[PDB]
Design a binder for this molecule. Structure first.
Ligand SMILES: OC[C@H]1CNC[C@@H](O[C@H]2O[C@H](CO)[C@@H](O)[C@H](O)[C@H]2O)[C@@H]1O
Length: 345
Protein backbone atom coordinates (compact mmCIF):
# COMPACT_ATOMS: atom_id res chain seq x y z
CA UNK A 1 0.00 0.00 0.00
CA UNK A 2 2.96 2.34 0.58
CA UNK A 3 3.48 4.91 -2.18
CA UNK A 4 6.97 5.00 -3.63
CA UNK A 5 8.55 8.47 -3.40
CA UNK A 6 11.37 7.65 -5.82
CA UNK A 7 8.94 6.75 -8.60
CA UNK A 8 8.01 9.73 -10.80
CA UNK A 9 5.07 9.55 -13.19
CA UNK A 10 4.87 12.10 -16.02
CA UNK A 11 1.55 13.91 -15.78
CA UNK A 12 -0.13 16.25 -18.23
CA UNK A 13 -2.59 18.97 -17.12
CA UNK A 14 -3.35 20.38 -20.57
CA UNK A 15 -6.72 18.69 -21.33
CA UNK A 16 -9.94 20.77 -21.55
CA UNK A 17 -13.67 20.20 -21.89
CA UNK A 18 -16.37 22.42 -23.38
CA UNK A 19 -18.20 22.43 -20.02
CA UNK A 20 -15.25 23.70 -17.93
CA UNK A 21 -12.75 25.25 -20.30
CA UNK A 22 -15.04 26.30 -23.19
CA UNK A 23 -13.23 23.92 -25.59
CA UNK A 24 -11.85 20.38 -25.81
CA UNK A 25 -8.24 21.52 -25.39
CA UNK A 26 -5.65 18.92 -26.47
CA UNK A 27 -8.33 16.33 -27.34
CA UNK A 28 -8.44 18.70 -30.36
CA UNK A 29 -4.89 19.02 -31.67
CA UNK A 30 -2.99 20.10 -34.77
CA UNK A 31 -1.67 17.23 -36.94
CA UNK A 32 2.13 17.67 -37.31
CA UNK A 33 3.79 18.25 -40.71
CA UNK A 34 6.26 15.60 -41.90
CA UNK A 35 9.81 16.87 -41.07
CA UNK A 36 10.99 15.23 -44.34
CA UNK A 37 7.91 16.20 -46.19
CA UNK A 38 7.39 18.90 -48.65
CA UNK A 39 7.62 22.60 -48.34
CA UNK A 40 3.97 23.48 -48.16
CA UNK A 41 2.11 20.89 -46.18
CA UNK A 42 -1.39 21.37 -44.90
CA UNK A 43 -1.63 18.50 -42.43
CA UNK A 44 -4.91 19.62 -40.81
CA UNK A 45 -6.31 19.18 -37.29
CA UNK A 46 -8.12 16.66 -35.10
CA UNK A 47 -11.30 18.33 -33.87
CA UNK A 48 -11.58 16.70 -30.39
CA UNK A 49 -15.14 15.48 -30.95
CA UNK A 50 -16.31 12.29 -29.24
CA UNK A 51 -15.62 10.46 -32.53
CA UNK A 52 -12.20 11.99 -33.18
CA UNK A 53 -9.62 12.82 -30.51
CA UNK A 54 -5.88 13.30 -30.72
CA UNK A 55 -4.91 9.86 -29.37
CA UNK A 56 -4.66 6.36 -30.81
CA UNK A 57 -6.29 5.16 -27.55
CA UNK A 58 -9.47 6.39 -25.78
CA UNK A 59 -9.66 7.46 -22.09
CA UNK A 60 -12.09 5.65 -19.82
CA UNK A 61 -12.79 9.06 -18.32
CA UNK A 62 -13.65 10.52 -21.74
CA UNK A 63 -12.59 13.94 -23.01
CA UNK A 64 -11.98 15.26 -19.56
CA UNK A 65 -10.87 18.61 -18.20
CA UNK A 66 -7.63 18.74 -16.24
CA UNK A 67 -9.29 21.39 -13.97
CA UNK A 68 -12.30 19.18 -13.11
CA UNK A 69 -12.22 18.41 -9.32
CA UNK A 70 -13.90 15.04 -9.94
CA UNK A 71 -11.22 14.09 -12.46
CA UNK A 72 -8.41 15.16 -10.12
CA UNK A 73 -9.84 12.95 -7.32
CA UNK A 74 -9.95 9.95 -9.72
CA UNK A 75 -6.45 10.58 -11.04
CA UNK A 76 -5.04 10.70 -7.49
CA UNK A 77 -6.86 7.44 -6.64
CA UNK A 78 -5.20 5.93 -9.74
CA UNK A 79 -1.75 7.08 -8.53
CA UNK A 80 -2.54 5.34 -5.20
CA UNK A 81 -3.48 2.19 -7.18
CA UNK A 82 -0.20 2.43 -9.18
CA UNK A 83 1.87 3.00 -5.97
CA UNK A 84 3.45 6.01 -7.75
CA UNK A 85 4.35 8.56 -5.06
CA UNK A 86 5.39 11.49 -7.29
CA UNK A 87 3.44 13.27 -10.00
CA UNK A 88 5.87 15.05 -12.37
CA UNK A 89 3.80 17.93 -13.69
CA UNK A 90 4.30 19.32 -17.21
CA UNK A 91 5.00 23.05 -16.94
CA UNK A 92 4.70 25.48 -19.84
CA UNK A 93 5.06 28.96 -18.24
CA UNK A 94 1.57 29.98 -19.37
CA UNK A 95 1.70 32.87 -16.99
CA UNK A 96 -2.05 33.22 -16.71
CA UNK A 97 -3.77 33.07 -13.39
CA UNK A 98 -5.61 30.01 -14.60
CA UNK A 99 -2.35 28.03 -14.86
CA UNK A 100 -1.72 28.95 -11.18
CA UNK A 101 -5.25 27.92 -10.19
CA UNK A 102 -4.89 24.53 -11.86
CA UNK A 103 -1.45 23.92 -10.27
CA UNK A 104 -3.08 24.74 -6.93
CA UNK A 105 -5.92 22.30 -7.60
CA UNK A 106 -3.47 19.46 -8.44
CA UNK A 107 -1.36 20.10 -5.34
CA UNK A 108 -4.43 20.08 -3.03
CA UNK A 109 -5.82 16.90 -4.65
CA UNK A 110 -2.42 15.17 -4.49
CA UNK A 111 -1.93 15.97 -0.83
CA UNK A 112 -5.25 14.31 0.11
CA UNK A 113 -3.69 10.96 -0.97
CA UNK A 114 -0.15 11.88 0.16
CA UNK A 115 1.03 12.12 -3.44
CA UNK A 116 3.88 14.61 -4.01
CA UNK A 117 4.30 16.93 -7.02
CA UNK A 118 7.41 18.02 -8.88
CA UNK A 119 7.75 20.09 -12.03
CA UNK A 120 8.67 18.99 -15.51
CA UNK A 121 10.07 22.13 -17.10
CA UNK A 122 9.15 22.08 -20.76
CA UNK A 123 10.79 23.97 -23.67
CA UNK A 124 8.51 26.94 -23.16
CA UNK A 125 8.80 29.95 -25.52
CA UNK A 126 12.22 31.73 -25.26
CA UNK A 127 13.27 29.47 -22.34
CA UNK A 128 16.85 30.38 -21.29
CA UNK A 129 18.86 30.15 -18.05
CA UNK A 130 17.83 33.64 -16.85
CA UNK A 131 14.04 33.12 -17.13
CA UNK A 132 14.52 29.49 -16.05
CA UNK A 133 16.08 30.87 -12.83
CA UNK A 134 13.24 33.43 -12.54
CA UNK A 135 10.71 30.61 -12.87
CA UNK A 136 12.42 28.20 -10.50
CA UNK A 137 12.45 30.99 -7.89
CA UNK A 138 8.75 31.69 -8.48
CA UNK A 139 7.74 28.01 -8.25
CA UNK A 140 9.71 27.42 -5.03
CA UNK A 141 8.38 30.71 -3.58
CA UNK A 142 4.78 30.03 -4.56
CA UNK A 143 4.51 26.26 -3.92
CA UNK A 144 7.53 25.34 -1.76
CA UNK A 145 5.48 25.35 1.46
CA UNK A 146 2.63 23.27 0.06
CA UNK A 147 2.59 19.95 1.90
CA UNK A 148 2.48 18.09 -1.46
CA UNK A 149 5.55 19.87 -2.93
CA UNK A 150 8.18 17.20 -3.55
CA UNK A 151 11.58 17.23 -1.82
CA UNK A 152 14.36 14.66 -1.87
CA UNK A 153 16.58 15.02 1.24
CA UNK A 154 15.37 18.63 1.65
CA UNK A 155 15.80 19.53 -2.04
CA UNK A 156 13.21 20.30 -4.74
CA UNK A 157 13.61 18.36 -7.96
CA UNK A 158 13.06 19.50 -11.54
CA UNK A 159 13.09 17.43 -14.72
CA UNK A 160 14.28 19.50 -17.69
CA UNK A 161 12.84 18.36 -20.99
CA UNK A 162 15.01 18.80 -24.12
CA UNK A 163 17.75 20.32 -21.94
CA UNK A 164 20.14 19.98 -24.93
CA UNK A 165 18.45 23.06 -26.46
CA UNK A 166 20.54 25.14 -24.02
CA UNK A 167 24.35 24.78 -24.26
CA UNK A 168 26.48 23.66 -21.24
CA UNK A 169 28.23 27.06 -21.13
CA UNK A 170 24.75 28.53 -20.45
CA UNK A 171 23.77 25.82 -17.93
CA UNK A 172 26.96 26.41 -15.95
CA UNK A 173 25.92 30.02 -15.16
CA UNK A 174 22.91 28.50 -13.44
CA UNK A 175 24.18 25.17 -12.13
CA UNK A 176 27.92 25.49 -11.42
CA UNK A 177 28.70 26.40 -7.81
CA UNK A 178 30.77 29.27 -9.29
CA UNK A 179 28.12 30.19 -11.90
CA UNK A 180 27.32 33.88 -12.50
CA UNK A 181 23.60 33.39 -11.72
CA UNK A 182 23.98 30.22 -9.65
CA UNK A 183 21.20 28.59 -7.63
CA UNK A 184 23.75 26.38 -5.83
CA UNK A 185 23.93 27.10 -2.08
CA UNK A 186 20.96 29.47 -2.27
CA UNK A 187 17.36 29.15 -1.01
CA UNK A 188 16.47 28.08 -4.56
CA UNK A 189 18.91 25.17 -4.96
CA UNK A 190 17.36 21.98 -6.42
CA UNK A 191 18.16 18.65 -8.01
CA UNK A 192 18.22 19.35 -11.75
CA UNK A 193 17.66 16.30 -13.89
CA UNK A 194 18.51 16.82 -17.57
CA UNK A 195 17.57 14.73 -20.60
CA UNK A 196 20.10 12.15 -21.73
CA UNK A 197 19.49 11.55 -25.39
CA UNK A 198 22.43 10.33 -27.48
CA UNK A 199 25.71 8.48 -27.13
CA UNK A 200 28.01 8.75 -24.08
CA UNK A 201 30.62 10.60 -26.20
CA UNK A 202 28.23 13.58 -26.35
CA UNK A 203 26.04 13.07 -23.20
CA UNK A 204 28.78 12.47 -20.62
CA UNK A 205 30.52 15.83 -21.09
CA UNK A 206 27.09 17.53 -21.52
CA UNK A 207 25.88 16.40 -18.12
CA UNK A 208 29.27 17.13 -16.46
CA UNK A 209 29.81 20.54 -18.13
CA UNK A 210 26.21 21.61 -17.57
CA UNK A 211 26.45 20.60 -13.88
CA UNK A 212 23.14 18.66 -13.80
CA UNK A 213 22.59 16.67 -10.61
CA UNK A 214 21.21 13.81 -12.70
CA UNK A 215 19.61 12.63 -15.92
CA UNK A 216 16.54 10.86 -17.27
CA UNK A 217 15.71 9.41 -20.68
CA UNK A 218 11.96 10.19 -21.08
CA UNK A 219 11.09 8.32 -24.29
CA UNK A 220 8.77 5.34 -23.86
CA UNK A 221 9.83 3.83 -27.22
CA UNK A 222 12.75 1.42 -26.89
CA UNK A 223 15.64 2.29 -29.17
CA UNK A 224 14.32 5.74 -30.15
CA UNK A 225 17.49 7.16 -28.54
CA UNK A 226 20.64 5.65 -27.03
CA UNK A 227 19.21 6.72 -23.66
CA UNK A 228 15.89 4.97 -24.26
CA UNK A 229 17.64 1.69 -25.22
CA UNK A 230 17.37 -0.34 -21.97
CA UNK A 231 20.44 -2.54 -22.71
CA UNK A 232 22.46 0.66 -22.09
CA UNK A 233 21.07 1.27 -18.64
CA UNK A 234 23.60 -0.76 -16.60
CA UNK A 235 26.53 1.17 -18.14
CA UNK A 236 24.65 4.46 -17.81
CA UNK A 237 24.11 3.73 -14.14
CA UNK A 238 27.74 2.78 -13.56
CA UNK A 239 28.82 6.13 -15.11
CA UNK A 240 26.28 8.01 -12.95
CA UNK A 241 27.53 6.34 -9.78
CA UNK A 242 31.17 7.02 -10.72
CA UNK A 243 30.35 10.70 -11.31
CA UNK A 244 27.99 11.43 -8.39
CA UNK A 245 24.93 11.76 -10.70
CA UNK A 246 21.34 10.56 -10.21
CA UNK A 247 20.16 8.30 -13.05
CA UNK A 248 16.36 8.13 -13.41
CA UNK A 249 15.62 5.90 -16.36
CA UNK A 250 12.19 6.27 -17.98
CA UNK A 251 9.96 3.23 -18.56
CA UNK A 252 6.68 3.09 -20.49
CA UNK A 253 4.07 0.52 -21.54
CA UNK A 254 4.20 1.28 -25.25
CA UNK A 255 4.26 4.17 -27.77
CA UNK A 256 2.18 5.34 -30.74
CA UNK A 257 1.52 8.87 -31.94
CA UNK A 258 0.33 8.43 -35.52
CA UNK A 259 -2.98 10.26 -34.99
CA UNK A 260 -0.98 13.48 -34.47
CA UNK A 261 2.13 12.33 -36.35
CA UNK A 262 0.94 10.08 -39.25
CA UNK A 263 4.48 9.92 -40.68
CA UNK A 264 5.95 8.57 -37.41
CA UNK A 265 5.00 4.86 -37.72
CA UNK A 266 8.59 3.67 -37.23
CA UNK A 267 8.42 4.76 -33.55
CA UNK A 268 5.39 2.52 -32.78
CA UNK A 269 5.93 0.00 -29.98
CA UNK A 270 3.00 -2.38 -29.42
CA UNK A 271 2.00 -3.19 -25.84
CA UNK A 272 1.61 -6.95 -26.51
CA UNK A 273 -0.72 -7.38 -23.51
CA UNK A 274 1.68 -5.92 -20.97
CA UNK A 275 4.75 -7.80 -22.21
CA UNK A 276 6.46 -4.63 -23.45
CA UNK A 277 5.93 -2.84 -20.11
CA UNK A 278 7.20 -5.84 -18.10
CA UNK A 279 10.38 -6.11 -20.18
CA UNK A 280 11.13 -2.37 -19.81
CA UNK A 281 10.38 -2.00 -16.09
CA UNK A 282 12.41 -5.16 -15.35
CA UNK A 283 15.39 -3.62 -17.22
CA UNK A 284 15.30 -0.49 -15.02
CA UNK A 285 15.12 -2.51 -11.81
CA UNK A 286 18.00 -4.73 -12.98
CA UNK A 287 20.24 -1.70 -13.68
CA UNK A 288 20.13 -1.05 -9.91
CA UNK A 289 19.02 2.57 -10.23
CA UNK A 290 17.84 4.49 -7.20
CA UNK A 291 14.80 6.02 -8.92
CA UNK A 292 12.49 5.36 -11.85
CA UNK A 293 10.33 7.63 -14.00
CA UNK A 294 7.24 6.47 -15.86
CA UNK A 295 6.29 7.80 -19.26
CA UNK A 296 3.51 8.39 -18.79
CA UNK A 297 0.42 8.83 -16.68
CA UNK A 298 -1.61 10.55 -19.43
CA UNK A 299 0.34 11.65 -22.50
CA UNK A 300 -2.61 10.45 -24.65
CA UNK A 301 -1.16 11.93 -27.89
CA UNK A 302 1.76 9.55 -27.65
CA UNK A 303 -0.01 6.36 -26.49
CA UNK A 304 2.41 5.92 -23.54
CA UNK A 305 -0.32 6.40 -20.95
CA UNK A 306 -0.97 3.98 -18.02
CA UNK A 307 -4.24 5.83 -17.36
CA UNK A 308 -7.23 3.49 -18.07
CA UNK A 309 -8.37 3.28 -21.65
CA UNK A 310 -11.57 1.70 -23.13
CA UNK A 311 -12.34 -0.07 -26.39
CA UNK A 312 -14.09 2.40 -28.80
CA UNK A 313 -14.79 2.62 -32.54
CA UNK A 314 -16.20 5.58 -34.42
CA UNK A 315 -16.83 6.53 -38.04
CA UNK A 316 -13.57 8.50 -37.72
CA UNK A 317 -11.24 5.97 -36.18
CA UNK A 318 -10.87 2.51 -34.66
CA UNK A 319 -9.08 3.20 -31.39
CA UNK A 320 -6.53 0.81 -29.93
CA UNK A 321 -7.23 -0.46 -26.43
CA UNK A 322 -5.65 -2.70 -23.80
CA UNK A 323 -6.49 -5.96 -25.70
CA UNK A 324 -6.75 -8.95 -23.30
CA UNK A 325 -6.34 -6.72 -20.23
CA UNK A 326 -8.81 -4.63 -18.26
CA UNK A 327 -8.71 -0.81 -18.50
CA UNK A 328 -6.92 -0.54 -15.13
CA UNK A 329 -4.28 -3.19 -15.85
CA UNK A 330 -1.39 -0.78 -16.44
CA UNK A 331 -2.08 0.85 -13.04
CA UNK A 332 -2.02 -2.45 -11.10
CA UNK A 333 0.88 -3.75 -13.15
CA UNK A 334 2.79 -0.56 -12.29
CA UNK A 335 2.04 -1.32 -8.56
CA UNK A 336 3.49 -4.78 -9.17
CA UNK A 337 6.76 -3.39 -10.55
CA UNK A 338 6.99 -0.69 -7.87
CA UNK A 339 6.84 -3.46 -5.22
CA UNK A 340 9.67 -5.30 -7.03
CA UNK A 341 11.67 -2.07 -7.27
CA UNK A 342 11.28 -1.44 -3.51
CA UNK A 343 12.43 -4.96 -2.59
CA UNK A 344 15.80 -4.60 -4.25
CA UNK A 345 16.34 -0.82 -4.15
O1 LIG B 1 6.72 16.29 -21.52
C1 LIG B 1 7.82 16.18 -22.44
C2 LIG B 1 7.36 16.07 -23.89
C3 LIG B 1 6.53 14.78 -24.05
N1 LIG B 1 6.02 14.63 -25.42
C4 LIG B 1 5.30 15.76 -25.96
C5 LIG B 1 6.15 17.04 -25.85
O2 LIG B 1 5.34 18.13 -26.27
C6 LIG B 1 5.16 18.21 -27.69
O3 LIG B 1 4.23 17.21 -28.13
C7 LIG B 1 2.86 17.36 -27.74
C8 LIG B 1 2.04 16.20 -28.35
O4 LIG B 1 2.52 14.96 -27.85
C9 LIG B 1 2.37 18.74 -28.18
O5 LIG B 1 1.10 18.91 -27.62
C10 LIG B 1 3.29 19.83 -27.62
O6 LIG B 1 2.89 21.12 -28.03
C11 LIG B 1 4.70 19.60 -28.13
O7 LIG B 1 5.58 20.57 -27.63
C12 LIG B 1 6.62 17.30 -24.41
O8 LIG B 1 7.45 18.49 -24.39
Amino acid sequence: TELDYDTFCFYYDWYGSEAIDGQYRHWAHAIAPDPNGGSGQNPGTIPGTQESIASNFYPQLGRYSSSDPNILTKHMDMFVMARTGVLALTWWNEQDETEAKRIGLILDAADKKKIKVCFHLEPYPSRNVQNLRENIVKLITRYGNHPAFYRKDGKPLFFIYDSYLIEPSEWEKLLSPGGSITIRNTAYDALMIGLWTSSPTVQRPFILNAHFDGFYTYFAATGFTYGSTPTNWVSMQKWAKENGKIFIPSVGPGYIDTRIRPWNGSVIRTRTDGQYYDAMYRKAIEAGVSAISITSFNEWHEGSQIEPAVPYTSSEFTYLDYENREPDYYLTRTAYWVGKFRESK
